[PDB]
PDB file of C-alpha atoms in Angstrom:
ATOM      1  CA  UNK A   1     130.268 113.644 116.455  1.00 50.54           C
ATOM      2  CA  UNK A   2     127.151 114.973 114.758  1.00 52.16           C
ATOM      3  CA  UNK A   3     125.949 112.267 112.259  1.00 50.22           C
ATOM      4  CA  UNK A   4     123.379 112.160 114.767  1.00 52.75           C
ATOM      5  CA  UNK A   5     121.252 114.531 112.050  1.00 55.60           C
ATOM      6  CA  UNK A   6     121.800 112.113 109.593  1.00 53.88           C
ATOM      7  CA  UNK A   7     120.696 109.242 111.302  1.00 54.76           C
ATOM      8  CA  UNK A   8     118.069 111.308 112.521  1.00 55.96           C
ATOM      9  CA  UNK A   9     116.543 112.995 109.823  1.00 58.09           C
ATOM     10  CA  UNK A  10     116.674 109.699 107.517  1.00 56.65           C
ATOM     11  CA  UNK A  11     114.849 107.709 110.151  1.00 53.60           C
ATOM     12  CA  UNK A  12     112.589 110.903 110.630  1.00 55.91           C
ATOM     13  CA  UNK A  13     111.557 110.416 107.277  1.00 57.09           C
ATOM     14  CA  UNK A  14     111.916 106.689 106.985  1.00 56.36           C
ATOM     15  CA  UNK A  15     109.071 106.794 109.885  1.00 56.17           C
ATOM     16  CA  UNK A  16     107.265 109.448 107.984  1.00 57.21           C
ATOM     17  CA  UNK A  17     107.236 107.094 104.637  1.00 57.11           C
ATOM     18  CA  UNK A  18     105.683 104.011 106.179  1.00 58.12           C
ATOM     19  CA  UNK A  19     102.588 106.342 107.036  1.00 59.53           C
ATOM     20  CA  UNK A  20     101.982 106.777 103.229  1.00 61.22           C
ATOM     21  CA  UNK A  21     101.951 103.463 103.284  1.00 61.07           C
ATOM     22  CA  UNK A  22      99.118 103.308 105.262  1.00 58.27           C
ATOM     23  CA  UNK A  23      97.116 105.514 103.542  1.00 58.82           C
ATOM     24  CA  UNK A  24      96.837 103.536  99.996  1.00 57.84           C
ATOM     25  CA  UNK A  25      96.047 100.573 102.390  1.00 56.52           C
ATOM     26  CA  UNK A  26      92.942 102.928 103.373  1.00 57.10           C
ATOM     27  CA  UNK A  27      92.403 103.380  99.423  1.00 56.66           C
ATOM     28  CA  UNK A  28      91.838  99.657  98.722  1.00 54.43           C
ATOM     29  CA  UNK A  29      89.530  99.340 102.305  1.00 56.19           C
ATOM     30  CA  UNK A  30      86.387 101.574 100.862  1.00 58.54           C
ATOM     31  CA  UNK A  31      81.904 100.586  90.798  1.00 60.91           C
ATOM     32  CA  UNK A  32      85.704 100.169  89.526  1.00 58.77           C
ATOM     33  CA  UNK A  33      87.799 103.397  89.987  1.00 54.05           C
ATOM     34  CA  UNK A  34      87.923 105.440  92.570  1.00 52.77           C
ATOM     35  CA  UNK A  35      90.211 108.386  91.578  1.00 52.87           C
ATOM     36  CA  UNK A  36      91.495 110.124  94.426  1.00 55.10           C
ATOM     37  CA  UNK A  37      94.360 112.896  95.661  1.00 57.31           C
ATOM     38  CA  UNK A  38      95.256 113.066  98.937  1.00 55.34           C
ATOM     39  CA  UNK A  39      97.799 115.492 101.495  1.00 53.08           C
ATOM     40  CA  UNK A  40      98.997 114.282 104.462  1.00 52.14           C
ATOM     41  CA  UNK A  41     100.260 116.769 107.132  1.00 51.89           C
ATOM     42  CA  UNK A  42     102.646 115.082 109.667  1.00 54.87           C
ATOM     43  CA  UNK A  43     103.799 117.154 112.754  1.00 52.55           C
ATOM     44  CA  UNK A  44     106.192 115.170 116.057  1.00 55.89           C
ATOM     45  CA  UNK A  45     108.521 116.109 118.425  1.00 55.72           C
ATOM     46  CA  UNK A  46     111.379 113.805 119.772  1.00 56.15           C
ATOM     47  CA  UNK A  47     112.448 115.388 122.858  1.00 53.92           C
ATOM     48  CA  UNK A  48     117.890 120.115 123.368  1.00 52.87           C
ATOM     49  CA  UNK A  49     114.939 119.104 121.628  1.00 54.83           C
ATOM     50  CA  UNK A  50     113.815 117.696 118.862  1.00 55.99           C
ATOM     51  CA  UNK A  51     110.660 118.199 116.064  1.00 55.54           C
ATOM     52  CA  UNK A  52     109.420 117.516 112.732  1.00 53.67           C
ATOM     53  CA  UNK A  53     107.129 118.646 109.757  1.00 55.18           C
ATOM     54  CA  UNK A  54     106.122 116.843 106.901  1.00 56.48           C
ATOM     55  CA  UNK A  55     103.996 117.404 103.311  1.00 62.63           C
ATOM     56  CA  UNK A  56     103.138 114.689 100.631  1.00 66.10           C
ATOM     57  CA  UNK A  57     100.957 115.384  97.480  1.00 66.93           C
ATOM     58  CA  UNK A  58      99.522 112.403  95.851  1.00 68.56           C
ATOM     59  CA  UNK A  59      97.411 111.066  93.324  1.00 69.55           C
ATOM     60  CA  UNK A  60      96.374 107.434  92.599  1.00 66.64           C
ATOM     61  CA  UNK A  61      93.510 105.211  91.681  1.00 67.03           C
ATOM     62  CA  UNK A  62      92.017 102.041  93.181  1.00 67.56           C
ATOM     63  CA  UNK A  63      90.610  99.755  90.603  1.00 67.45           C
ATOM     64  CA  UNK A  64      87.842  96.879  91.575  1.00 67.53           C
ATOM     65  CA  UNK A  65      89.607  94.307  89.111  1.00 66.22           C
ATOM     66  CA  UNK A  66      86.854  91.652  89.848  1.00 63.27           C
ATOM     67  CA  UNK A  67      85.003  89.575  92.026  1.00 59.95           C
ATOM     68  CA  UNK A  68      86.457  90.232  95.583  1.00 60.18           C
ATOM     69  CA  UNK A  69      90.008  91.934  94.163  1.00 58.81           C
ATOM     70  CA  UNK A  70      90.837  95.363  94.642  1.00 60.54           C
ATOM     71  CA  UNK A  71      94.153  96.801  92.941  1.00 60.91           C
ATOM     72  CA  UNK A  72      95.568 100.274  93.893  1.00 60.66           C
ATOM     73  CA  UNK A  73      98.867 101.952  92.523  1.00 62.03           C
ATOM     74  CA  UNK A  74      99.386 105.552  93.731  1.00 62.89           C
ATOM     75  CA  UNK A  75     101.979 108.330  93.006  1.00 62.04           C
ATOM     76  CA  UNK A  76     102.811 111.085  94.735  1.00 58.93           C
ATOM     77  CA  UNK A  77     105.803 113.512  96.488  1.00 55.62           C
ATOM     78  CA  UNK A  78     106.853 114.697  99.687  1.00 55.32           C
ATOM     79  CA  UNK A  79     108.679 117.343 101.481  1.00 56.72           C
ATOM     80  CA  UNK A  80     110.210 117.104 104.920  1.00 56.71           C
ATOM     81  CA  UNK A  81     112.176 119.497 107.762  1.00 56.81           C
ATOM     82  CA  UNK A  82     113.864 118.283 110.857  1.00 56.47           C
ATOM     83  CA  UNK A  83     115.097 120.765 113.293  1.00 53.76           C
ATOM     84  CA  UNK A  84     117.409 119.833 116.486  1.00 54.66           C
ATOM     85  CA  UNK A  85     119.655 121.580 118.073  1.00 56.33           C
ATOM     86  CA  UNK A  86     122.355 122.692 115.581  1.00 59.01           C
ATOM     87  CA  UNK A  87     121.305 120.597 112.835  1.00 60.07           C
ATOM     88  CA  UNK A  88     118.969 121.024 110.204  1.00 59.05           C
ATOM     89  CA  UNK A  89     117.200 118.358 107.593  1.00 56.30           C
ATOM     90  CA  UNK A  90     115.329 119.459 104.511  1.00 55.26           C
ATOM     91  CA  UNK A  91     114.044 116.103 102.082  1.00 55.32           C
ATOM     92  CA  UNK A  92     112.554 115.816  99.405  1.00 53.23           C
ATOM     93  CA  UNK A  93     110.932 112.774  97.796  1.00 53.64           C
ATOM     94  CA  UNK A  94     109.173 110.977  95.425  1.00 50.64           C
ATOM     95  CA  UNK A  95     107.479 107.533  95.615  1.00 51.10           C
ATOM     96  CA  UNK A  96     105.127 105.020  93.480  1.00 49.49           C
ATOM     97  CA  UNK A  97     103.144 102.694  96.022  1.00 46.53           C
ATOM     98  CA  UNK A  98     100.451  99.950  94.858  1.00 46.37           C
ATOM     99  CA  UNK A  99      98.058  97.755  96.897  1.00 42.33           C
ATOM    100  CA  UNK A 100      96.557  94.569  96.402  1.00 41.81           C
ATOM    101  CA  UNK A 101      93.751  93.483  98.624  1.00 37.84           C
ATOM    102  CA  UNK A 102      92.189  90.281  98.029  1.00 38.58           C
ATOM    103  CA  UNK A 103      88.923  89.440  99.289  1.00 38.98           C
ATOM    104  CA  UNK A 104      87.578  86.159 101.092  1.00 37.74           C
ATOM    105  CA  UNK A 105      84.021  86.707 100.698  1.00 39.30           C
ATOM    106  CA  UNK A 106      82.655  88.665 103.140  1.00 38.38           C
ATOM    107  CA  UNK A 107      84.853  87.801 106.545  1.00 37.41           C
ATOM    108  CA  UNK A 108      88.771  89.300 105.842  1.00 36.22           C
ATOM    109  CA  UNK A 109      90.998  89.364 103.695  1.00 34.33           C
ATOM    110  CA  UNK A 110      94.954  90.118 102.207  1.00 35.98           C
ATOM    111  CA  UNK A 111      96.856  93.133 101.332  1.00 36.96           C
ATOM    112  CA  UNK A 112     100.005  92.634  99.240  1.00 38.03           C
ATOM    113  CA  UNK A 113     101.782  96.534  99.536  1.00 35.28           C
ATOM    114  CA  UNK A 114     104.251  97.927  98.048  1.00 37.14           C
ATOM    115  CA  UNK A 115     107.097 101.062  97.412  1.00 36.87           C
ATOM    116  CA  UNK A 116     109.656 102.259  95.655  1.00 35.82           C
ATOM    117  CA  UNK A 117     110.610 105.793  96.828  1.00 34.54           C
ATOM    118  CA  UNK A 118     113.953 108.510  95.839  1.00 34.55           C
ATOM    119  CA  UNK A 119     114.669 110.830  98.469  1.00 34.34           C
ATOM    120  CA  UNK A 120     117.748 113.245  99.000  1.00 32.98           C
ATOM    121  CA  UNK A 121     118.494 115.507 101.690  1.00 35.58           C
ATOM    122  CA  UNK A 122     120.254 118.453 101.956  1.00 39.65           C
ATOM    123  CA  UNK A 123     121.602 118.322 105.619  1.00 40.12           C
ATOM    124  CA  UNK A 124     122.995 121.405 107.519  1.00 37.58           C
ATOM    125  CA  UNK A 125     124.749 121.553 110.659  1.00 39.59           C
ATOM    126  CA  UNK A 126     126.600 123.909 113.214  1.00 39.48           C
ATOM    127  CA  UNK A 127     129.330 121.799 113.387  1.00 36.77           C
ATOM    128  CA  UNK A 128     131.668 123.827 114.946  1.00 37.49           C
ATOM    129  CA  UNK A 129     131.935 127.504 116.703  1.00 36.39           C
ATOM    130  CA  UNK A 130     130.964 130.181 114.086  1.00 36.55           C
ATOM    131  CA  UNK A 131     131.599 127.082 111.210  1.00 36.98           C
ATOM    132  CA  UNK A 132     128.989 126.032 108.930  1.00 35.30           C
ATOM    133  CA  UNK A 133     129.346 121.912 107.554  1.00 35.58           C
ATOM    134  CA  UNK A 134     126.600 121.128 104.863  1.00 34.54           C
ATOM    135  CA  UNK A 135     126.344 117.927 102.937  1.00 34.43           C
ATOM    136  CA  UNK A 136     124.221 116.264 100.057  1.00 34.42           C
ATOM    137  CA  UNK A 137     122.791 112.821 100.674  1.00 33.90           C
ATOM    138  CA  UNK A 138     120.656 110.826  98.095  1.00 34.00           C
ATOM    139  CA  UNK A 139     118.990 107.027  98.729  1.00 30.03           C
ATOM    140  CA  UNK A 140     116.090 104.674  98.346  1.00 32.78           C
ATOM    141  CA  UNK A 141     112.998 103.665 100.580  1.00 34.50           C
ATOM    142  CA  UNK A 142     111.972 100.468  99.231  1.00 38.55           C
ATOM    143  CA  UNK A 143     108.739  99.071 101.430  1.00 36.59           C
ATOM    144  CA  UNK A 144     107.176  95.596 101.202  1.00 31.21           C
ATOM    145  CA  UNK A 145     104.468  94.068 102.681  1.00 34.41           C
ATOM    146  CA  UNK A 146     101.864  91.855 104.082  1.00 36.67           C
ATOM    147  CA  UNK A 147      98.477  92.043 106.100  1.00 38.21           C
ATOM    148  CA  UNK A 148      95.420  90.719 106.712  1.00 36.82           C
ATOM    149  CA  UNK A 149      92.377  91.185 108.032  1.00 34.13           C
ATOM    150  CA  UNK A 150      88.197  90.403 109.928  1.00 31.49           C
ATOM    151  CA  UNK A 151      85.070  92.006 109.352  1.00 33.12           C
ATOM    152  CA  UNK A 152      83.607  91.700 112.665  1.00 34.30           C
ATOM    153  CA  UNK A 153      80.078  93.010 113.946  1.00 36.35           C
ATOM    154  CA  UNK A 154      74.255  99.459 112.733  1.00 35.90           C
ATOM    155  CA  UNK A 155      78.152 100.139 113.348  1.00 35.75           C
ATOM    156  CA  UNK A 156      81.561  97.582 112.730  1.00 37.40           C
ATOM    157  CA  UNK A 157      84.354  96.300 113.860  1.00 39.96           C
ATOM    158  CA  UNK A 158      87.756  95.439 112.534  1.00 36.81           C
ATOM    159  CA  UNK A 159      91.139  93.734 113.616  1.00 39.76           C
ATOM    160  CA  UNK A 160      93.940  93.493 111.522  1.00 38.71           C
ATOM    161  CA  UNK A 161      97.615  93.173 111.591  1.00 39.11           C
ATOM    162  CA  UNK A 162     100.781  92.365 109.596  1.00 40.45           C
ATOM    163  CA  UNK A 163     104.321  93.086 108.745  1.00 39.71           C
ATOM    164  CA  UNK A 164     106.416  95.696 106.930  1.00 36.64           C
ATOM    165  CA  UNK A 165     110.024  95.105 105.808  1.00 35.81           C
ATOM    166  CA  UNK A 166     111.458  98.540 105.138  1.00 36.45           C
ATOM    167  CA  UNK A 167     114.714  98.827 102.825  1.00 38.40           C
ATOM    168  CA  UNK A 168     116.893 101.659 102.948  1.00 37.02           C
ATOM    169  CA  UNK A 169     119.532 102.162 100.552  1.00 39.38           C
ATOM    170  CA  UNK A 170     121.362 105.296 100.959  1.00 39.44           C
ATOM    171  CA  UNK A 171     124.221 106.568  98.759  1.00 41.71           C
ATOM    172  CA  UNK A 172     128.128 107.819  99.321  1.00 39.86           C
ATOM    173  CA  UNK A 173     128.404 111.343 100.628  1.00 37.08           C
ATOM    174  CA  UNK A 174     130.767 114.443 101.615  1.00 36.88           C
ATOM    175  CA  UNK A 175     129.904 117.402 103.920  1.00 34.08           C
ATOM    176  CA  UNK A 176     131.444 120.318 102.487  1.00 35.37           C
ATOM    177  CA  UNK A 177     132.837 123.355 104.324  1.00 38.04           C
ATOM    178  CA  UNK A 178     134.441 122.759 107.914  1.00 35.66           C
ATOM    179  CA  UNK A 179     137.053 120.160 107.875  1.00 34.55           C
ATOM    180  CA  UNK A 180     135.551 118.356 110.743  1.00 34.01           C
ATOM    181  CA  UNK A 181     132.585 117.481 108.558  1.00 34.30           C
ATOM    182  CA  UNK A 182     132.312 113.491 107.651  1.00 36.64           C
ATOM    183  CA  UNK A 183     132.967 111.697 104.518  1.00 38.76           C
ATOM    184  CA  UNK A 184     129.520 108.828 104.305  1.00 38.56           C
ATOM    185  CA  UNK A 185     130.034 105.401 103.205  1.00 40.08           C
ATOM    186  CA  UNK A 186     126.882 104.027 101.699  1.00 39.54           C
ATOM    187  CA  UNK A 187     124.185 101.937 103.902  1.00 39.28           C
ATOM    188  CA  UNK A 188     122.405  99.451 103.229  1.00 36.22           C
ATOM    189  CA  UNK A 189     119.740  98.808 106.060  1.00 32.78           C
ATOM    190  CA  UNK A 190     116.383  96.633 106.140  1.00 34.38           C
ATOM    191  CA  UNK A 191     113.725  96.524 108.979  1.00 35.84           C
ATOM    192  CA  UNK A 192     110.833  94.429 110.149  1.00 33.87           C
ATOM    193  CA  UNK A 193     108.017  95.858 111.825  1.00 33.29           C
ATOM    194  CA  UNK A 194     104.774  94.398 113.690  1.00 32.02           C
ATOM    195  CA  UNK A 195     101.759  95.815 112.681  1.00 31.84           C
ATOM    196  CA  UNK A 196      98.428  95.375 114.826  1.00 30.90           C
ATOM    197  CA  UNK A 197      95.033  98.277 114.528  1.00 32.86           C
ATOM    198  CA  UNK A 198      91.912  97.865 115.860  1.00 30.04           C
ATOM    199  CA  UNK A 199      89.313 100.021 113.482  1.00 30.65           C
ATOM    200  CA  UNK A 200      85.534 101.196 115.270  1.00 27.61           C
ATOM    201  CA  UNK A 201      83.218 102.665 112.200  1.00 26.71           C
ATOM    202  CA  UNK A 202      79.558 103.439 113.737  1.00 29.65           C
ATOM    203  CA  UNK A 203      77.647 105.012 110.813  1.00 32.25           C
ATOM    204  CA  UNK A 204      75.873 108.279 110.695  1.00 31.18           C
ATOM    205  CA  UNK A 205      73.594 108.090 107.877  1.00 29.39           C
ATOM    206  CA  UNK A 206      73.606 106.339 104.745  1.00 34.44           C
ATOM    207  CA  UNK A 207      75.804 108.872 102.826  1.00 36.27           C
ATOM    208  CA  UNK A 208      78.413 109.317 105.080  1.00 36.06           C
ATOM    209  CA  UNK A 209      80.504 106.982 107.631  1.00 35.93           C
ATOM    210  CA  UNK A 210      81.844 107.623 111.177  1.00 38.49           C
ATOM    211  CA  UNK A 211      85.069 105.706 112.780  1.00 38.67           C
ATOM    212  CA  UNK A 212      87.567 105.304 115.858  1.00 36.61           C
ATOM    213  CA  UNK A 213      91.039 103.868 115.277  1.00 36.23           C
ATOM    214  CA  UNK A 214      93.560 102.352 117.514  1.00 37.86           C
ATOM    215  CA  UNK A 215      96.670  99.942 117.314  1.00 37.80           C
ATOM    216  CA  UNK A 216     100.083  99.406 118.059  1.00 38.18           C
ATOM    217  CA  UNK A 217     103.394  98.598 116.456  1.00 39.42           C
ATOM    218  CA  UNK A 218     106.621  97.348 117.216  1.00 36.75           C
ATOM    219  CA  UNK A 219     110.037  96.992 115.612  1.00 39.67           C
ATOM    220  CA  UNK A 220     110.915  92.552 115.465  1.00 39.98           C
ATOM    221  CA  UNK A 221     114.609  94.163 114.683  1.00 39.01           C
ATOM    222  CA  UNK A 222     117.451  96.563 114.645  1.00 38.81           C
ATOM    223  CA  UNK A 223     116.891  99.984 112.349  1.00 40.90           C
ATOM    224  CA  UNK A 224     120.085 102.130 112.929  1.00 43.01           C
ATOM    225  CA  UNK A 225     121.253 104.776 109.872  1.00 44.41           C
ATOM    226  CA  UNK A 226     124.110 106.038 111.183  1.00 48.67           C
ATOM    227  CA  UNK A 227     127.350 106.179 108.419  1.00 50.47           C
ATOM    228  CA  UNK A 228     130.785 105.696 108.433  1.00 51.68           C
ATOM    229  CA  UNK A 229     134.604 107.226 109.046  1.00 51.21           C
ATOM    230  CA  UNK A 230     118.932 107.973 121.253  1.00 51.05           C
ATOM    231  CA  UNK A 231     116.061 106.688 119.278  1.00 50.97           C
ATOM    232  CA  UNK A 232     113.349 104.344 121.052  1.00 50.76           C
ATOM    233  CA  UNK A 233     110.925 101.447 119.857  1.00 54.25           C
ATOM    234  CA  UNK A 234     107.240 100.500 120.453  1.00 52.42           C
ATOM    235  CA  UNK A 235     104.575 103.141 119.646  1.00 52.88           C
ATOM    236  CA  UNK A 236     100.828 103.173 120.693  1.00 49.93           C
ATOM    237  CA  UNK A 237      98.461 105.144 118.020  1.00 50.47           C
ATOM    238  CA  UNK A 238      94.769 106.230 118.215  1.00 51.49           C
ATOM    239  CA  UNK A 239      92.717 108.109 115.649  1.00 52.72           C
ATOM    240  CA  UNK A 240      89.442 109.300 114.200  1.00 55.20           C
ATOM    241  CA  UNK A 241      87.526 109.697 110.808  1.00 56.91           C
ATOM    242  CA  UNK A 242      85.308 109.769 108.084  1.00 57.18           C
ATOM    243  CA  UNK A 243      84.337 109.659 104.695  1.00 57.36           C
ATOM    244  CA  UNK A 244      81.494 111.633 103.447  1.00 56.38           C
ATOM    245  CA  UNK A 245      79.167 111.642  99.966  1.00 56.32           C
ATOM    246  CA  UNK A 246      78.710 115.030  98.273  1.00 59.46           C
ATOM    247  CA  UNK A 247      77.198 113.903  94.816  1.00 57.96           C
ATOM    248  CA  UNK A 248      77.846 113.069  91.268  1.00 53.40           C
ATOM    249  CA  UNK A 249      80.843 110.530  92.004  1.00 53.82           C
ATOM    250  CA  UNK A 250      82.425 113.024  94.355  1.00 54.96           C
ATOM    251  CA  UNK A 251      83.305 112.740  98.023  1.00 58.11           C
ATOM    252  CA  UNK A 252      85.422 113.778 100.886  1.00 63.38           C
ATOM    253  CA  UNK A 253      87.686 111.633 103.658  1.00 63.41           C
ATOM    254  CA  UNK A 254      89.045 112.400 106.751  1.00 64.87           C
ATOM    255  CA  UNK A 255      91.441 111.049 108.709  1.00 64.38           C
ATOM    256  CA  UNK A 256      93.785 112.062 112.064  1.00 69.52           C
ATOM    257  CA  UNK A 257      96.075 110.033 114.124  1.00 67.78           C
ATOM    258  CA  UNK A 258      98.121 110.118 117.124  1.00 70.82           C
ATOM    259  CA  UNK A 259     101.275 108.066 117.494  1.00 70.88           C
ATOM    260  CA  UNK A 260     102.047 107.514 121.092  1.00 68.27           C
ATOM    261  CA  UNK A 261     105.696 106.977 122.783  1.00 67.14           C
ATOM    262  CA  UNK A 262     107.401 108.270 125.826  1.00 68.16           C
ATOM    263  CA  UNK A 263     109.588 110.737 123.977  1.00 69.26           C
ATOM    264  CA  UNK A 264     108.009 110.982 120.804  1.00 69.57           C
ATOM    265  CA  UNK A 265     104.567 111.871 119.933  1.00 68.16           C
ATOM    266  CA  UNK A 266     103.609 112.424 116.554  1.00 67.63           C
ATOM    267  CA  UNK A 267     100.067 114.164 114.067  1.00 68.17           C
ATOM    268  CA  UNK A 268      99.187 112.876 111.333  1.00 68.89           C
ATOM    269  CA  UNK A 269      96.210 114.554 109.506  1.00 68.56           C
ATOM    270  CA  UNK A 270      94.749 113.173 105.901  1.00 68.39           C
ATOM    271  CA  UNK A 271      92.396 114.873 103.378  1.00 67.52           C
ATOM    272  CA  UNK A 272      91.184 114.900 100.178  1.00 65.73           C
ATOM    273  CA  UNK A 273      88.795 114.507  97.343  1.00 67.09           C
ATOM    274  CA  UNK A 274      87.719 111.300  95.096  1.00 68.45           C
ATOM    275  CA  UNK A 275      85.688 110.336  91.868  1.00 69.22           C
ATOM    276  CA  UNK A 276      83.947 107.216  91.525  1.00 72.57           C
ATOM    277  CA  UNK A 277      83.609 106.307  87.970  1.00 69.69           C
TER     278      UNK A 277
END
């Protein structure tokens, strides 16, 4: 029985969502504000064979709230396709995230994180000969947590790692039009994950800053989606950036990264501008 889309898609974009993440973690790491607006382009394949595409706007600030605190709450959307072989996944989303990185003097420090995120799909699937089944889903991302970090040693190094607890509320559903189509029961789901990036930032001038990223991260426990009456683990990632100075506040950032399995690679490719005030 197909369900496999919705199990698929939701994790598709549950994956997806713990990348934004990742970025407002990046908008604490860089004077108080820092306005800044962001898009991040995601683009995987799973495999019949699966694939992925992904959009987020997003606009939030990161406030220096004194000596050695940093405080960070961004807002933005997202929309997101999933095609397999009958079945396709359109979402659409909207999330508040906020960041809190404290400081101990100059050799690491912590990062409380969190999200609250809406997303629906609208799921469509061949799920029959010549007989169309479509459905309208709706649920909750809700992402907490914790990470730390070292300044290590022109050019710098940096190790860091922590956990993510990932909870995934998804509403009651029907999938209207062939009779073969299911009837969801809700879900409630929740997830621990390892986190653990190594970060290489050699500098170029002093106006603009050069890095190398890689690190690794694992699931401590089951994440499952599927509803009622394939999917692998461990991923290696690598990237490259940097952020650049044009002026009178203004600058750039650049980011890319490559998320490394056997049987599912994904791109994920940040940009965007910034005023320091």
């Amino acid at each position: 029985l197909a369900a496999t889309v919705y199990a698929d898609s939701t994790a598709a974009h549950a994956d997806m969502q713990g990348r934004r993440l990742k970025a407002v973690s990046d908008g604490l790491d860089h004077t108080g504000l820092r306005v800044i607006a962001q898009t991040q382009q995601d683009g995987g394949t799973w495999e019949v064979e699966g694939k992925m595409r992904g959009s987020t706007q997003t606009v939030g600030i990161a406030a220096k709230t004194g000596e050695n605190t940093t405080a960070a709450a961004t807002l933005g959307m997202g929309r997101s396709t999933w095609s397999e072989n009958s079945a396709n996944a359109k979402t659409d989303s909207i999330s508040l995230f906020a960041g809190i990185r404290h400081d101990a003097g100059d050799i690491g420090y912590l990062k409380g994180l969190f999200s609250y995120g809406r997303y629906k799909n609208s799921i469509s699937r061949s799920t029959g000969a010549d007989e169309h089944a479509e459905g309208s889903v709706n649920g909750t991302l809700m992402q907490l947590g914790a990470l730390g970090g070292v300044n290590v040693p022109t050019g710098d190094l940096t190790v860091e790692g922590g956990l993510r607890y990932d909870l995934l509320k998804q509403d009651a559903f029907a999938e209207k039009g062939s009779a073969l189509g299911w009837s969801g029961n809700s879900l409630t789901e929740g997830t621990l994950v390892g986190l653990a990036g190594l970060k290489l930032s050699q500098p170029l001038s002093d106006k603009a800053v050069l890095f190398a990223t890689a690190g690794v991260e694992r699931d401590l426990n089951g994440r499952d989606y599927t509803v009622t009456g394939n999917m692998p683990h461990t991923r290696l990632v690598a990237g490259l950036g940097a952020d650049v100075e044009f002026g009178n506040g203004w600058n750039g950032l650049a980011r890319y990264s490559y998320a490394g399995s056997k049987q599912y690679g994904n791109h994920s490719g940040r940009v965007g501008v910034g005023y320091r005030f």
